[PDB]
């Protein structure tokens, strides 16, 4: 069992899933409305969104309080966030600007990937070695979508039997997608293209928000019960409360290097020869050059205007 990193509005916490009865440790305190959270393990970085400050920040683990603002403008409700630990990128969703965007880890070179046909985008998850990103939208037409990490080839993968898809996560070892629906009261799983869908957990989910996974176990936060719960990812059996009496549990991850599998960065040492952004791509050579928003990529496919 892993450490679980979770956002908690006024702070970010870490609880040992193996001992959820003890006090959680406060990794970062003095926050206003911390919602989304992720990390880059090899870099010793933890990122979070704050929906009242309208910002994304980061710190260095156990070398705090060296906290920095990384995205400060053009955000209103940054409800979801994911770190590309391979391409070294930051992705996020905003349910009020209706946008999915990407930037470097330091916030530079920001690029709007999608800004249309988004209503209530929420959770976002990345498969950097496959060049895909996945997100949920709990709006008027609820759905789960995926697209290239370079913003290519957007497609809807789930759009039936869905209402409030709040949590989303990936199993890198088994190539499976998992999500939590807070209105329909279940957790489901499917192939990464959404096919071969199956029920996992079918009750006791009054208000799941965020979902993660480690080894044979799913972990999630529930807004109603103010706790973290777990079950078996194959059978949905062994439903149990891991950690209780949480002030306001939010986004959550299994905090482990093993949850960010190593691979070769297709961008290589020289940023793939891109002048600005080198983004993971699902198509060979598995990276794609890109430019900050508004600026056009030239004919050579590598240099921005």
């Amino acid at each position: 069992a892993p450490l679980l990193l979770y956002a908690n509005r006024r702070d970010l916490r870490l609880v040992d899933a193996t001992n959820g009865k003890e006090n959680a440790t406060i990794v970062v305190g003095g926050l206003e409305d911390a919602a989304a959270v992720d990390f880059v393990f090899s870099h010793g970085l933890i990122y979070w969104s704050d929906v009242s400050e309208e910002a994304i920040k980061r710190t260095e683990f156990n070398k705090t309080e060296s906290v920095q603002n990384v995205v400060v403008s053009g955000l209103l409700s940054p409800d979801g966030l994911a770190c590309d630990w391979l391409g070294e990128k930051l992705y996020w969703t905003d349910s009020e600007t209706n946008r999915i965007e990407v930037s470097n880890l330091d916030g530079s070179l920001r690029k709007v990937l999608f800004w249309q046909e988004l209503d209530q985008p929420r959770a976002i998850a990345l498969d950097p070695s496959s060049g895909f990103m996945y997100w949920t939208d709990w709006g008027e037409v609820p759905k789960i979508e995926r697209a290239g990490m370079d913003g290519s080839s957007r497609f809807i993968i789930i759009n039936s039997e869905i209402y409030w898809p709040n949590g989303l996560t990936l199993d890198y070892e088994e190539q499976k997608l998992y999500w939590a629906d807070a209105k329909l009261n279940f957790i489901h799983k499917s192939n990464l293209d959404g096919t071969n869908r199956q029920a996992v957990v079918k009750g006791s989910l009054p208000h799941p928000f965020a979902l993660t996974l480690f080894e044979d176990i799913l972990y999630w936060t529930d807004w109603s019960t103010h706790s973290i719960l777990a079950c078996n990812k194959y059978t949905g059996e062994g439903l149990r409360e891991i950690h209780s009496d949480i002030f306001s549990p939010m986004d959550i991850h299994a905090f482990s290097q093993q949850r960010q599998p190593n691979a070769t960065n297709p961008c290589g040492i020289d940023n793939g020869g891109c002048s600005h952004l080198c983004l993971m791509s699902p198509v060979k050579p598995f990276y794609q050059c890109a430019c900050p928003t508004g600026v056009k990529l030239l004919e050579n496919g590598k240099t921005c205007k």
């Epitope: 409305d33 919602a35 009242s52 349910s95």
Partner: antibody, heavy 126, light 108 residues
Framework: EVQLVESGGGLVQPGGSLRLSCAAS????????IHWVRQAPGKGLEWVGW????????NYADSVKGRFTISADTSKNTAYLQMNSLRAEDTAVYYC???????????????????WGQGTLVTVSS | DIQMTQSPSSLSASVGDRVTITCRAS??????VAWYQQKPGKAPKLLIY???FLYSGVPSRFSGSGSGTDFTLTISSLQPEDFATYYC?????????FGQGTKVEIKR
């Protein structure tokens, strides 16, 4: 426009029960918190509890926990306050009020009460 | 429970006067504070939430400020129709709790 209409208030003997209703219209019932708040004659406002009709989850004030419960019939867009073992001190005007914003939103205004019913008077007396 | 303490519990001021009502929380509730106006025999009406956000349709003379534990309601220019009891409330966590209220009378 948003509307909340309370009914069922009345004279009731101590130790008795009474069910109040809150009929809602003009907004999506299942997207909201619905609160009950009471005010004794000449006194302040006291939150009694809330329900989120989508699944029927509730929270209650310590003062009424064990005696009062809240339920909702989404087919009728109506919430109910079931009051048991009534005491003289329960005498008050009971309001139902809607929380602001969407129950599923991250920026949560669910405890900000933006629309209130007219209230219904409950008198616990012999 | 978070105790919300208003002061003063009542006041009288003249039309055109600037009036200040304070609300103090026993814990840090960030900016999760709302203000309501209650006229006699009527339900409370929301004036302000998130400490400083003026609710649609509410007169500009009403404003709220504050953060953490100390919050203020200001009426910049008191009007005769402002006779009421005003309540602060934390919307920060369960249970929602209200201040004891401040009765405002018009001095003429």
């Amino acid at each position: 426009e948003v509307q909340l209409v309370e009914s069922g208030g009345g004279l009731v003997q101590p130790g008795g029960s009474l069910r109040l209703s809150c009929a809602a219209s003009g907004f999506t019932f299942t997207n909201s918190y619905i609160h009950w708040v009471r005010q004794a004659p000449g006194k302040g406002l006291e939150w009694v509890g809330w329900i989120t009709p989508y699944g029927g989850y509730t929270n209650y004030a310590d003062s009424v926990k064990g005696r009062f419960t809240i339920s909702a019939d989404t087919s009728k867009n109506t919430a109910y306050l079931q009051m048991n073992s009534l005491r003289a001190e329960d005498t008050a005007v009971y309001y139902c009020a809607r929380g602001s914003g969407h129950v599923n939103a991250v920026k949560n205004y669910g405890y900000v009460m933006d629309y209130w019913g007219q209230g219904t008077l409950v008198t616990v007396s012999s | 429970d978070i105790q919300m303490t208003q002061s003063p519990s009542s006041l009288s001021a003249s039309v055109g006067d600037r009036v200040t009502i304070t609300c103090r929380a026993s814990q840090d509730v960030s900016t999760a504070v709302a203000w309501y106006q209650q006229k006699p025999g009527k339900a409370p009406k929301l004036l302000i939430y998130s400490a400083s956000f003026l609710y649609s349709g509410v007169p500009s003379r009403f404003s709220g400020s504050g953060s953490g534990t100390d919050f203020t309601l200001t009426i910049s220019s008191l009007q005769p129709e402002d006779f009421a009891t005003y309540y602060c409330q934390q919307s920060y966590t369960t249970p929602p709790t209200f201040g004891q209220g401040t009765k405002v009378e018009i001095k003429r």
